[PDB]
Amino acid sequence: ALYEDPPDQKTSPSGKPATLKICSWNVDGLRAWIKKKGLDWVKEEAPDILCLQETKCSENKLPAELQELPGLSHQYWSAPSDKEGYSGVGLLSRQCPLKVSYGIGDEEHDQEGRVIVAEFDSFVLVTAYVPNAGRGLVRLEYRQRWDEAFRKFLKGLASRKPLVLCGDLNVAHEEIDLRNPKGNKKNAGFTPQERQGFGELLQAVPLADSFRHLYPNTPYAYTFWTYMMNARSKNVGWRLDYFLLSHSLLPALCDSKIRSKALGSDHCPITLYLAL
DNA sequence: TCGACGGATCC
DNA sequence: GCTGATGCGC
DNA sequence: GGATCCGTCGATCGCATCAGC
Ligand SMILES: [Ca+2]
Ligand code: NA
Incomplete structure (x- = not known):
């Protein structure tokens, strides 16, 4: 069936108002996405922090439209070392961060421009574009090494500040998170x-799956539909894009959204609301 | 993802 | 700047 | 021996590279 994301809850479980809006989006071609009206949608969603995955765009080619962006003034980018046109992430944020790291501290897993880490006062935000296993699973054994090292790094991080993980994690956790699970x-x-791998990331760090925590039996809620076979029109998709929260911040959770109606990529954008 | 391909196995 | 062909994607 | 029932097996749209001139 189809899905209607429920209205935005901007008050916390204790009725504190939301202070902080993190939107995350696998833009699948930053340049294509900007041309497909993507940045207009960002201006009207007006996040405090915008996380972009799969930018497929070097720093040189980064379109002009982004310098104009003024509520998203501080702007951080990472593209792979030697593979041009591939992967890439970004982190734009209204307020200026305390520190910005690239990578997870593992030479093996830091060559593809996939993670930005941003330390704010109350918490630390990691935004990640996780590597796909590949067609025919040619990368699936690499993915297991990634998942284990990314888990270790994230456990280390969350032991020092509360942690928001967002972005495209390239896995549908459970048979509810995709339309055709058995196939x-x-x-x-x-x-x-x-x-x-996902469940170990959930139990190891630990992190709660923000969206499922609030809507643990809602189905047909997805972040990605393939471009082929009109899959998005029939809503035949997957939940790939999460906010993963430290349990500590669960009482700060106001809501976790899926912005199904925002076009521009093969992923819709998701949005997090915190009281911080 | 969706179909055409088999090659199976059931009335 | 073009063509045409590859890489990479859930 | 017709008709369904199964797991493999293509090409499916999109973006961005690249080789070459
Ligand atoms: Ca490939
Ligand atoms: Na006969």
Whole structure:
């Protein structure tokens, strides 16, 4: 069936108002996305922090439209070392961060422009574009090394500040997070190993799955539909884009959204509301 | 994702 | 700047 | 021996590279 994301809850479980709006979006071609009216949608959503994944754009080519962006003044980018046109992430934020790191501290997993870390006063925000297992699972064993090292790094991080992980994690955690689960159990993003990986990330750091925590039996809620076969029109998609929260910040959670109606990519954007 | 391909197995 | 062909994607 | 029932197996749209001139 189709999905209607419920209205935005901007008060916390204790009725404190939301102070902080993090929107995250796998833009699948920053340049294509900007041309497809993507930045207009960002201006009207008006986040405090915008996280972008799969920018597929070097720093040189970064379109002009982004310098204009004024509520998202501080702007951080990471693209791979030697593979041009591939992967890439960004982190734009209204307020200026205390510190910005690139990578997870592992030479092996830091060559593809996938993670930005941003320390704010109350918490630390990691935004990640996780590597796909590949068509035919050619990268699936790399993905298991990634998942284990990314888990270790994130456990280390969250032991020092509360942690918001956002972005495209390239796995549908459970059979509710995708429309055709039994047909994809051998495909990238729903192998037992990717799903086992996610659950270990949830129990190890630990982190609660922001959206599922609030809506644990809502189905047909997805972040990505393939461009092929009119899949988005039939809403035949996957939940790939999460906010993963330290349990500590669960009482700061106001709401976690899926912006199904925002076009511009093969992922819709998700949005987090915190009282901080 | 969706279909055409088989090659199976059931009335 | 163009064509045409590859890489990479859930 | 017709008709359904199964898991493999293509090409599916999109973005951005690249080789070459
Ligand atoms: Ca490839
Ligand atoms: Na006969």
